[PDB]
């Protein structure tokens, strides 16, 4: 890529423990003498974080790229300003809007652009011997900055640029969050005095900035600085001096902390809501001194370990060539009825066949067809005019939906409608499709009417001669390419099926796996999903029943589509948890009781 | 077997689904 440094004995990272860190304000609401619980992104107490060293005054300089999760907690123990800037991005290759926040000795620069970062970007000042001055020299961050989206430069100031040695004297805590594109940074400074490790105690976190940006931040990195003077061998490729400071990076989790608001309105105490039973009691009672007694908590739940899939082995595939976009269909008064069964159905094999115009499934989601098992697939195909497409819907009026095809109110099925002008349109007109004008009565759902008798408008009996008030019901359309869009023919296919009603065999392409018993795991049978234990049964079923329901109206027994065995479903969520406490002033230990 | 008498034993005998109810929150 660019340039790199040699002689970097990177020590293996170590794991350390925190001491109540990451307690900020939930919002801009003042609270006093009131205990309120929020649900944001905090850091769990007594958590395990990673400790990265950077002391050199030996030979330690490691600052890799870390993935940006939901909230980042960055602690920095320094004494001479070692941590410099921060970068946020995703790929870092001049193809993603990268954010760079640097605290230069003259200005604080914040640039949302498209930088080209190297393998090891950093800064480096030079210290002279004849004169005491700290000037910046090496700036190995980006090679060129072309496009940008945001630029902010702070006021010119004077920075001392420290570089002494000793013990840690400053602690900087930063909390980064991203909510609806808004990047919120909270900063806190503390003038402590200790050797190493991590200082304890509790302190509030004041907000710093809230940038209303809108980028996709995936990873981040921290750029430090190097000191070059008379201690360096005399080159910028191998000699370097990181300094002597420590930094801890941790990921925030959606926890719940109860804060103690006094008369001043500042957070002086934080209690966890999910760690110890005493902490849970203090969270529930919204207090600190729990009296002697017993309290019921959440029920015991077993987390699933595996997930078995059960479906019958079906090899045949449902033909969609003659169903969708074939060659010649019937009219509207005598629609074509087709039966589809004993094959694997799928909707992802329809977009590549022909580009449709309208697709709507009433009573079932269009993207959840493969997650269920179809039952009795009836395809009603016909060809109508573009001016009567909206009439074909469960709950509409008109003439075509009343004197030809009927849809029930509680109809659960899909309807597809696509234009067909390449074949159903002639230069002189297509007179092969007929439609019924009027009718004496209505039509029952799913009924074919092939009555070719003389219709009677009012008075004057016809007696088969076609005279006054004696019109013919079957009339022709007028499919011609010289007309508009509404006059073009449209092929409409209605697919009707049942969802968990009779033991069918359509289902989807979901293959079956293994089978494990005596475990509370997930399972799927004929599209019906459940969670529990599948134990052996001893009852006798009937050769036309699949699922079984008792008094509680739940799936008690299930028949396997392959082994043809009956398995009983048993839930594992059964148990109570209680915490017995003798008092806060007495002791801090409690007792756990399982009912 | 317990610490009861004969009249108490007679009265206790005159006074007289569980998992299906417990598997839905209804606990005893």
């Amino acid at each position: 890529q660019c340039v790199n440094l040699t002689t970097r004995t990177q020590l293996p990272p170590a794991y350390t423990n925190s001491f109540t860190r990451g307690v900020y304000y939930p919002d801009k609401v003042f609270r006093s003498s009131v205990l309120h619980s929020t649900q944001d992104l905090f850091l769990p107490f007594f958590s395990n974080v990673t400790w990265f060293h950077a002391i050199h005054v030996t030979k330690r300089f490691d600052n890799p790229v870390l993935p940006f999760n939901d909230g980042v907690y960055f602690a920095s123990t320094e004494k001479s300003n070692i941590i410099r800037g921060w970068i946020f991005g995703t790929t870092l290759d001049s193809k993603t809007q990268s954010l760079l926040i640097v605290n230069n000795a003259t200005n604080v620069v914040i640039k949302v652009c498209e930088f080209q970062f190297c393998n090891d970007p950093f800064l480096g000042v030079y210290y002279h011997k004849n004169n005491k001055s700290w000037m910046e020299s090496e700036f190995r961050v980006y090679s060129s900055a072309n496009n940008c989206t945001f630029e902010y430069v702070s006021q010119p100031f004077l920075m001392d640029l420290e570089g002494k040695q000793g013990n840690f004297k400053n602690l900087r805590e930063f909390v980064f969050k991203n909510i609806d594109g808004y990047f919120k940074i909270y900063s806190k400074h503390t003038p402590i005095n200790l050797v190493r490790d991590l200082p304890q105690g509790f302190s509030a976190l004041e907000p710093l900035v809230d940038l209303p940006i809108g980028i996709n931040i995936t990873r981040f990195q921290t750029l430090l600085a190097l000191h070059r003077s008379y201690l360096t061998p005399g080159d910028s490729s191998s000699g370097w001096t990181a300094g002597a400071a420590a930094y801890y990076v941790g990921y925030l989790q959606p926890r719940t902390f109860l804060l103690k608001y006094n008369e001043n309105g500042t957070i002086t105490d934080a209690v966890d809501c999910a760690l110890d039973p005493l902490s849970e009691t203090k969270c529930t009672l919204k207090s600190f001194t729990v009296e002697k007694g017993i309290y019921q908590t959440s029920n015991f739940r077993v987390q699933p370990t595996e997930s078995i899939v059960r479906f019958p082995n079906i090899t045949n595939l449902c033909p969609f060539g003659e169903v969708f976009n074939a060659t010649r269909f019937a009219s509207v008064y005598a629609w074509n009825r087709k039966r589809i069964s004993n094959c694997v159905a799928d909707y992802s094999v329809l977009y590549n066949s022909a580009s449709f115009s309208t697709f709507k499934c009433y009573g079932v989601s269009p993207t959840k067809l493969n997650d269920l098992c179809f039952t009795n697939v009836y395809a009603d195909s016909f060809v109508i005019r573009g001016d009567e497409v909206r009439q074909i819907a469960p709950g509409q009026t008109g003439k075509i939906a009343d004197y030809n095809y009927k849809l029930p109110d509680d109809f659960t099925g899909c309807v597809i409608a696509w234009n067909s002008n390449n074949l159903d349109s002639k230069v002189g007109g297509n007179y092969n499709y007929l439609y019924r004008l009027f009718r004496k009565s209505n039509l029952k759902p799913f009924e074919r009417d092939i009555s070719t008798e003389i219709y009677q408008a009012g008075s004057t009996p016809c007696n088969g001669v076609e005279g006054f008030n004696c019109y013919f019901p079957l009339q022709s359309y007028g499919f011609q390419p010289t007309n508009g869009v509404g006059y073009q023919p449209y092929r409409v296919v209605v697919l009707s099926f049942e969802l968990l009603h009779a033991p069918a065999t359509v289902c989807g392409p979901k293959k079956s796996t293994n089978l494990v018993k005596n475990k509370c795991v997930n399972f799927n049978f004929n599209g019906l999903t459940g969670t529990g234990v599948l134990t052996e049964s001893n009852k006798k079923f009937l050769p036309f029943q699949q699922f079984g329901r008792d008094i509680a109206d739940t799936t008690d027994a299930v028949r396997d589509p392959q082994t043809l065995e009956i398995l009983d479903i048993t839930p594992c969520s059964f148990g109570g948890v209680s915490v017995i406490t003798p008092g806060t002033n007495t002791s801090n230990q409690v007792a756990v009781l399982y009912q | 077997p317990s610490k009861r008498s004969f009249i108490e034993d007679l009265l206790f005998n005159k006074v007289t689904l569980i998992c299906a109810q417990k598997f839905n929150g209804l606990t005893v």
Partner: protein, 50 residues
């Protein structure tokens, strides 16, 4: 027994099984049915507690 049988009622829906509804319809559409079921069960529990 009445509280057990209340789980079989529909309260103006299509079924009483939550998994059956979640497997047949998308989440951004069964919210009204879930709310109606929750309201009916809460009313039943309130009557039982009274």
């Amino acid at each position: 027994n009445t509280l057990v049988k209340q789980l079989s009622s529909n309260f103006g829906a299509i079924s009483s099984v939550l998994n059956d509804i979640l497997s047949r319809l998308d989440p951004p559409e069964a919210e009204v049915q879930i709310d109606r079921l929750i309201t009916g069960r809460l009313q039943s529990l309130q009557t039982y507690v009274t």
